[PDB]
Amino acid sequence: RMKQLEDKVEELLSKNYNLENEVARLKKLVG
Amino acid sequence: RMKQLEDKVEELLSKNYNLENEVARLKKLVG
């Protein structure tokens, strides 16, 4: 369960980097 | 450290929900 929690942190960080990359692409379209 | 890992999961999920809400607002502007 240490490892499962660590795995979930790594997974959520990857998801937020994808969301960050998407926000930047959309902001480039608006801006 | 169990608690610290759990805290980090909860924090990253809140960040991704904010990013999700931002993506939806920007997509509403484009769409």
Each domain of chain B, given as residue ranges in start order, spans: 1-31
Other CB atoms within a 10 A radius of the CB of residue A15 amount to: 16
**Amino acid at residue number B1:** R
Other CB atoms within a 10 A radius of the CB of residue A8 amount to: 16
d(CA B6, CA A5): 7
Q: Which two tokens stand for residue B13?
A: 């999920």
CB A26 within 8 A of CB B21: no
Mutate to test the interface with A, among B22, B25, B28, B30 (most CBs of A within 10 A): B22
Method by which the coordinates were obtained: X-ray
CB B9 within 8 A of CB A2: no
For residue A14, what are the contacts with CB-CB under 8 A and spacing of at least 6? none
Which residues of chain A are within 8 Å of residue B26 when distances are taken between CB atoms? Answer: 23, 26-27, 30
Other CB atoms within a 10 A radius of the CB of residue A7 amount to: 10
CA distance A14 to chain B (A): 10
Resolution value (Å, 1 decimal)? 1.9
Are A6 and B2 within 8 A, CB to CB?
no
d(CA A4, CA B17): 21
